[PDB]
């Protein structure tokens, strides 16, 4: 089997991407944030504290004839940005782009933090990291991809995120029309439960390529590109007036600037992020100070190849017995 679904930016800055997902019988369609940096499929629901729901579409298990309470099971997740959610668990039928999994753990939120409430466009998350990170207790549950994998034509999914435009998540096949040149594959460590890999280096603008190993994760659920402070300083040094602002919480730059590109290495291959992809707009409405899309990972403990990096590429998440990651230009 295969599946194919369109993923759409939630706003004009590409802060995140939502993909429609059919849950239950009859189908309830929710728009979920596909997140290769986590492993829980959780949704706003009829159980979510009412004051914490503000415009989201909810899953109502009582209206699904295929929903079954997973007795005794609870979940609770915190993300790096300080957001969180928790609740109980049902199993139900879940379909993405024509690909159907029966008995999928659907984690129903009883509580969500303010950042989720405030985002009316995101109805939940669909995790696509390794199932070892799944938070369900006392019986850990599998991701949608893990459940689907044996049935897929090939045990892979791909992320093709757009810049200010829709893109595509595919399951079970590689669309050879969706990228240019060849896909370069690189090793993955699953030891931390992430799609963790090592970039071979970077360049800033038309500058020389610096060969240096940068260990990090391919994370569709993180907006920005978080890299070591040395690398980030080298980038912003090429933008006149750019500075790190503690009060804003990162690098900002004059909105009048033209940003240089940023290149990252995948083996001997190179992915070029255009300057425009690194612009996240005014820090507040009407400001002439703009927020940067490349930020230091120094306070995080891991480097993160988030949407800013991934949307510059066609990315293959290869879930073979030994997983690997593939990157192509597009
Ligand atoms: C790890 C991390 N530290 N910091 C400062 C950031 C911003 C992250 C990434 C992160 O939190 N991503 C996320 C958020 C919500 C849902 C899914 N992914």
DSSP per-residue string spanning 193-251: SS-EEEEEEEEETTSPPEEEEEEEEE-TT--SEEE-HHHHHHHHTTSTT-EEETTTTEE
Distance between Cα 323 and ligand 1 center (Å): 23
Is the CA virtual torsion 71, 39, 168, 308 positive or negative? positive
Unique residue bearing structure tokens 């255009």: 274
Torsion of CA 121, 123, 128, 133, to 10 degrees: 120
- Give the chain's count of helices (H) and strands (E): 4, 24
Candidate of 42, 80, 196, 297 to mutate for ligand 1, largest count of ligand atoms within 8 Å of Cβ: 80
First to last CA, the chain: 25
What lines the ligand 1 site, CB under 6 Å?
Answer: 35, 37-38, 79-81, 83, 221-222, 300
Q: For residues 141 and 147, give the distance between their C-alpha atoms in angstroms, rounded to a whole number.
A: 10
Distance between Cα 214 and ligand 1 center (Å): 19
Q: Report in angstroms the alpha-carbon separations of 49 from 81, 198, 214.
A: 22, 41, 42
Distance between Cα 62 and ligand 1 center (Å): 32
In terms of DSSP bridges, do strands 68-78 and 167-171 run parallel, antiparallel, or are they unpaired? unpaired
Beta bridge partners of 70: none
Report the nearest-CA residue for atom 12 of ligand 1: 222
At residue 314, the 3 state secondary structure works out as strand
Can 119 be counted among the known catalytic residues? Answer: no
Which experimental technique did the depositors report for determining this structure? X-ray
Can 92 be counted among the known catalytic residues? Answer: no
Contact 14, 5 (CB under 8 A): no
Q: For residues 80 and 99, give the distance between their C-alpha atoms in angstroms, rounded to a whole number.
A: 30
Residues in the chain: 330
Domains of the chain by range and CATH?
Answer: 5-174 (2.40.70.10), 175-330 (2.40.70.10)
Q: For residues 266 and 89, give the distance between their C-alpha atoms in angstroms, rounded to a whole number.
A: 39
Point out the catalytic residue in the list 86, 199, 261, 296: 199
Distance between Cα 221 and ligand 1 center (Å): 7
């Amino acid at each position: 089997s295969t599946g194919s679904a369109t993923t759409t930016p939630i706003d004009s800055l590409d802060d995140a991407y939502i993909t429609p997902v059919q849950i239950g019988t009859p189908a309830q369609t929710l728009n979920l944030d596909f997140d290769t940096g986590s492993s829980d499929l959780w949704v706003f629901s009829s159980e979510t504290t009412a004051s914490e729901v503000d415009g989201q579409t909810i899953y109502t298990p009582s209206k699904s004839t295929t929903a079954k309470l997973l007795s005794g099971a609870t979940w609770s997740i915190s993300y790096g940005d300080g957001s969180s959610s928790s609740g109980d668990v049902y199993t139900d039928t879940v379909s993405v782009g024509g690909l159907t999994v029966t008995g999928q753990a659907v984690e129903s939120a009883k509580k969500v933090s303010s950042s989720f409430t405030e985002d009316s466009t995101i109805d939940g998350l669909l995790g696509l990291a390794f199932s070892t990170l799944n938070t369900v207790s006392p019986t850990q549950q599998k991701t949608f991809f893990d459940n689907a994998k044996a049935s897929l034509d090939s045990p892979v999914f791909t992320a093709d995120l757009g810049y200010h435009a829709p893109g595509t998540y595919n399951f079970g096949f590689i669309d050879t029309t969706a990228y240019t040149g060849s896909i370069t594959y690189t090793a993955v460590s699953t030891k931390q439960g992430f799609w963790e890999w090592t970039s071979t280096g970077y360049a800033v603008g038309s500058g020389t390529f610096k060969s240096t190993s940068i260990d990090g994760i391919a994370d569709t659920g993180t907006t920005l590109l978080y890299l070591p402070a040395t690398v980030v300083s080298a980038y912003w040094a090429q933008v006149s007036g750019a500075k790190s602002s503690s009060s804003v919480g990162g690098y900002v730059f004059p909105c009048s600037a033209t940003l240089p590109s940023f290149t990252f290495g995948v083996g001997s291959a190179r992915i070029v992020i255009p300057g425009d992809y690194i612009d996240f707009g005014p820090i507040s409405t009407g400001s002439s100070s703009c927020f940067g899309g490349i930020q230091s990972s120094a306070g995080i403990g891991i480097n993160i190849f988030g949407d800013v990096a991934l949307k510059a590429a066609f990315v293959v998440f290869n879930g073979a017995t030994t997983p690997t990651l593939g990157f192509a230009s597009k």
